[PDB]
Design an enzyme around this catalytic site. Structure first.
Site, PDB file in Angstrom:
ATOM      1  N   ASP A 131       0.887  -1.160   0.000  1.00  0.00           N
ATOM      2  CA  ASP A 131       0.000   0.000   0.000  1.00  0.00           C
ATOM      3  C   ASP A 131       0.928   1.215   0.000  1.00  0.00           C
ATOM      4  OD1 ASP A 131      -3.126   0.696   1.646  1.00  0.00           O
ATOM      5  OD2 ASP A 131      -1.624   2.207   1.049  1.00  0.00           O
TER       6      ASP A 131
ATOM      7  N   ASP B 295      -2.607   2.934  -5.621  1.00  0.00           N
ATOM      8  CA  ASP B 295      -1.612   2.806  -4.570  1.00  0.00           C
ATOM      9  C   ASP B 295      -1.678   1.493  -3.797  1.00  0.00           C
ATOM     10  OD1 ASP B 295      -3.394   5.304  -2.561  1.00  0.00           O
ATOM     11  OD2 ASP B 295      -3.851   3.192  -2.918  1.00  0.00           O
ATOM     12  N   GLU B 296      -2.376   0.499  -4.339  1.00  0.00           N
ATOM     13  CA  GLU B 296      -2.454  -0.816  -3.693  1.00  0.00           C
ATOM     14  C   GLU B 296      -2.151  -1.967  -4.668  1.00  0.00           C
ATOM     15  OE1 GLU B 296      -6.786  -0.518  -2.577  1.00  0.00           O
ATOM     16  OE2 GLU B 296      -6.101  -0.289  -0.503  1.00  0.00           O
TER      17      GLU B 296
HETATM   18 CA   LIG Z   1      -5.904   3.939   0.870  1.00  0.00          CA
END
Ligand SMILES: [Ca+2]
Length: 341
Positions: A7, A102-103
């Site tokens: 993350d 963002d993951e």
């Molecule tokens: Ca988040």
DNA sequence: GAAGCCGGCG
DNA sequence: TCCGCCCGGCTTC
């Protein structure tokens, strides 16, 4: 199975601090406007220290952080930054699922040869790499599955490394709160708190139909398989980031032969943005009055552009059968569920 | 089939 | 006590 969830910490703020080294050590607020009203996308460390948080209106953020720098969101740049990192991760994973900008979940089972301790060390290797090559901090979670991996990362933010070992998963599943679970937000938490379900373990003792009446069968069996430690669903090579494109039409119209030149261009700019093969296409027509009319084929396997044109045509040629009343002002396409190769 | 309405969530 | 060319899921026409 060994899964590493990566993350990115307050990604947009971190990208901005990187391109603009003179932002570091001083409050920074990334802003987002709509189709206008400003809210906080992300805020850097010293901004957050002042109480600035995502969703906060921009005037409000200013009241409590007058010394902050407010910069506009630049999606394209954040997307390119993300891509370099997603590609870094790719070199380490048997399978990688890009969940969002963002993951990402990484199945590393084969890479570490089933060795859990070697999984933990690889996740250390990955943080150190992302930091060295791209100067971003990330939080990782190493776990027997996707959901546990996410949950432990969430518990170890920021710049952390959360671990759940298969030989100790039961102690984690004993202490796990009901609210700390993906799919359970602030409303559904309260209603499970209406039966005396605070923790996960509790459901095992409760009567099964009542949980279903509060969550539906989909999340009922989802929470069960979790509490029982039977949740299996693996990591596929697929990107969940949606790639779309819109073009305003020269005037509001309902003529397919007029709007198709613009839909083909829309598909163009989208498919050329992809790298992989989408499992869903969505034609989006924005009407005169600014109302939205969308339809999509969920393809068992993938869709190429060669398949897509007439699939996207009879999508619109149905949108207009569905709406003989109003003219299209803007036409857009959306490709998603992309298969990675 | 698909409008509508909730809920997660970023 | 936050809107989204959200998105997914379940109800209901
Ligand atoms: Ca988040």
């Amino acid at each position: 199975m060994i899964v590493i969830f990566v993350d990115f910490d307050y990604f947009f703020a971190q990208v901005e601090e990187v391109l603009n080294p003179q932002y570091k050590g001083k409050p920074l607020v990334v802003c987002v406007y709509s189709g206008t009203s400003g809210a906080v996308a992300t805020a850097n460390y010293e901004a957050r220290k002042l109480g600035v948080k995502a969703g906060m209106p921009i005037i409000k953020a200013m009241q409590i952080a007058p010394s902050a720098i407010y910069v506009p969101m630049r999606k394209p740049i954040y997307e390119a930054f993300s891509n370099r990192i997603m590609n870094l991760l790719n070199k380490h994973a048997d399978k990688i699922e890009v969940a969002s900008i963002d993951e990402a979940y990484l199945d590393v089972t084969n890479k570490v040869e089933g060795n859990f301790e070697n999984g933990i060390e690889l996740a250390r290797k990955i943080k150190q790499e992302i930091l060295e090559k791209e100067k971003i901090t990330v939080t990782v979670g190493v776990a027997p599955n996707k959901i546990l991996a996410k949950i432990i990362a969430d518990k170890s933010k920021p710049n952390g490394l959360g671990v759940i070992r298969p030989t100790e998963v039961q102690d984690f599943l004993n202490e796990l709160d009901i609210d700390e679970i993906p799919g359970i937000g602030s409303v559904l938490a309260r209603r499970l708190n209406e039966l005396g379900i605070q923790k996960l373990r509790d459901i095992l003792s409760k009567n099964y139909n009542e949980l279903e009446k509060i969550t539906g069968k989909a999340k009922a069996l989802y929470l069960l398989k979790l509490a029982q430690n039977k949740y299996s669903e693996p990591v596929e090579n697929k990107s969940k980031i949606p790639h779309g494109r819109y073009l305003t039409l020269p005037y509001n119209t309902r003529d397919v032969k007029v709007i198709l030149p613009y839909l083909k261009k829309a598909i163009n700019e989208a498919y050329n943005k992809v790298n992989g093969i989408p499992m869903r296409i969505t034609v989006i027509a924005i009407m005169e009055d600014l109302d939205i009319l969308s339809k999509g084929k969920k393809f068992k396997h993938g869709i190429s552009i060669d398949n897509a044109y007439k699939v996207a045509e009879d999508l619109l040629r149905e949108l207009l059968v569905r709406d003989k009343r109003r003219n299209v002002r803007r036409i857009g396409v959306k490709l998603d569920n992309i298969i990675i190769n």
